[PDB]
Amino acid sequence: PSVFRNFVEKGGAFAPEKGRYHLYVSYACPWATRTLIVRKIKGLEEFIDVSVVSPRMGAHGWPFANVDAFPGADADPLFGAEHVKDLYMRVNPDYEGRFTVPILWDKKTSAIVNNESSEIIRMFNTAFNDQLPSDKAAIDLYPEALRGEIDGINEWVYDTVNNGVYKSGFATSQKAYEAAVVPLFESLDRLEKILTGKDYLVGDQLTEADIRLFVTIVRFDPVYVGHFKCNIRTIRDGYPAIDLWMRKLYWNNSAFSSTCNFEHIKTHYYWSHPQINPHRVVPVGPIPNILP
Amino acid sequence: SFNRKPSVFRNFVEKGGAFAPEKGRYHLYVSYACPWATRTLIVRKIKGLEEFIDVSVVSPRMGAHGWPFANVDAFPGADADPLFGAEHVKDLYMRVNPDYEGRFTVPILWDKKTSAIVNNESSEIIRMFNTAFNDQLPSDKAAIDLYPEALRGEIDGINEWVYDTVNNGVYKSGFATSQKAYEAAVVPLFESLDRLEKILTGKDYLVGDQLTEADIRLFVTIVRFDPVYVGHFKCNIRTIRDGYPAIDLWMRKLYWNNSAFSSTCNFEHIKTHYYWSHPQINPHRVVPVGPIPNILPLHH
């Protein structure tokens, strides 16, 4: 239940202006990786900067490179912040919500525009088109011919897959655990017969629906199988077409390979959850992280 | 780092000795989840001793007081203690020696006549179940020898590094409290699994093209490798199903073609024990739906 739900739209308080917005993310959080993937498909590395927090979350939440100097992590360049908490309590000092990543930060106002990944990739989809080159501005991860159909698939993929892995690993009872994994793999079987032969989830063109499914499927086999007990079967050997669909987004599209740091992924989940893995031991994991 | 503790009771059921092979004299305390106990049960049915040694099945939900019996924890397939009404396996060790400071492991070979423990080392128990009782068994069951002396050099050879890197290596992988000790155990394990993969390629048994104990000591670990050991012990470099086809296929030929490996294999007891009994590896005691199925069919 994320707060801050404002959009960067022309003629608004948050207008698409170059070098005005900063994106606080982690390479491990799948909702943050959404924003980053879309940020590179449309070439916005000149409109939105990115600070990568350390994956070893704990006690004080997401830390920055000054307190925890993990490879690939950035220090906070806007403020002297040590943890993501500092940006939330900057805007509201009695904020009782959570310190969720990603964060799209407005430098000009010094406030949070949005931290809901579904919308950030969608404002990263419109808004900035006037200032982008012709090829990168042509990309549309949400054309309205197949829009309504995307929200349909994105809705049950969100509930059973994107979030289903989380109610699997974080469940504290056997009953709640089983209530989450079975719909997860049932929807994975439904997704498996969708992507048989097809190369994309919808309409022969890469869409956000592929992206919201990719960031969780890319972490299914390394993390979600062992750490979240989503082990009915693996995407590697149980879902061959889902597997192959994922690897051609990975090896044939730069916005998925450069946005995928398995070190941050596996280190975060296994280290920052002491009540699922008390000794913070990260397995050598499935080798390799992803097949060719 | 995980350092196992050796067994204290190491007497044998042999010739004119204190422990002679007499029908209905010995009681075997086991659990369907313990792979070292499952050794005893596999050998007990290959050589047909179900009328010489009875078996009490301990509840798989170990915890606090160690292995409990069906009277304190009523899990399906678990038995109560019929000889002394014991609540936990600890009681049988403490019965014979009230100043016994060791651990309360299973299996237990109990001498009813002395009211004492004959043996609690699985490596030797499967070897006394192979000798001793041959005079009293039928010809078919007495002919079986899981340790013929022609191959008593290959068996101890393979059994030595299979125990250290595979049988016990899986335990020092999962029970490790540090990243280095974890990595120090998983790498030799899968290295020995690669070596095991090239041995059993084409072959039907580990040594000399016949069912030996070495096949039995390796089976009890491989059959639970994919269900428990991958997720719970983070031994997930590869799975036996899709990474080691010859080890996998070797295991399924012992499972589906020999009843003494299927009837001694209760996956529920296996998966419930490891996930419920280790609150320092899985604090909320949640047992995954696991790899489906527990073991692949004989045609794959």
Residue A93 phi/psi, 5-degree rounding, is -70, -15
In degrees, rounded to 5, the angle at the alpha carbon of residue B264 between the alpha carbons of residues B294 and B147 is 115
- Interface test with chain B among A281, A282, A289, by most B beta carbons within 10 Å: A281
Task: Indicate if the alpha-carbon torsion angle A124, A125, A131, A132 is positive or negative.
Answer: positive
Chain B CB contacts of A284 under 8 Å are 183, 186-187, 234, 236-237
Report which of A116, A130, A105, A128 is spatially closest to residue A158, judged by C-alpha positions. Answer: A116
Report which of B93, B117, B103 is spatially closest to residue B9, judged by C-alpha positions. Answer: B117
Structure-determination approach:
X-ray
Secondary structure element (H or E) that encloses residue A190, with its range: helix A174-194
Q: How far is CA A268 from CA A85, A225, A230, A250, B93, in A?
A: 18, 15, 17, 21, 44
Resolution in A: 3.2
B179 contacts A281? CB cut-off 8 A: yes
Residues B31, B269 contacting (CB under 8 angstroms) = yes
Secondary structure element (H or E) that encloses residue A212, with its range: helix A208-217
- DSSP conformational letter for A53: P
> What CATH number did the domain enclosing B198 receive?
1.20.1050.10
- Cβ atoms within 10 A of the Cβ of B3, count? 6
Work out the burial of residue A157: count CB atoms within 10 Å of its CB; fewer than 13 is exposed, 13-18 middle, 19 or more buried. Answer: buried
Sequential DSSP letters for chain B? -------S-B----SSSSS---TT-EEEEEESS-HHHHHHHHHHHHTT-TTTEEEEEEPS---SSSSBPTTTS--TT----TTT--SBHHHHHHHH-TT--S---S-EEEETTTTEEEE--HHHHHHHTTTTGGGGS-HHHHH--SS-GGGTTHHHHHHHHHIIIIITHHHHHHT-SSHHHHHHHHHHHHHHHHHHHHHSSS-SSSSTTS--HHHHHHHHHHTTIIIIITTTT---S--HHHH-HHHHHHHHHHHHS-HHHHTT--HHHHHHHHHHH-TTTSTT-PPP--SSSSS--S--
Minimum CA–CA partner of B287 in chain A:
A174
The partner residue sitting opposite A284, judged by closest CB among B186, B242, B285, is: B186
Q: Which of A8, A23, A28, A29 is catalytic?
A: A29
Report which of B228, B241, B217 is spatially closest to residue B166, judged by C-alpha positions. Answer: B217
Chain B CB contacts of A229 under 8 Å are 231, 286, 288-289
Annotation says B34 is catalytic: yes
- DSSP conformational letter for A279: T
- What distance in Å separates the CA atoms of residue A62 and residue B222, rounded to the nearest whole number? 40
User: Domain containing A174: what range?
Assistant: 146-272
- Interface test with chain B among A284, A287, A291, by most B beta carbons within 10 Å: A284
Residues B41, B233 contacting (CB under 8 angstroms) = no
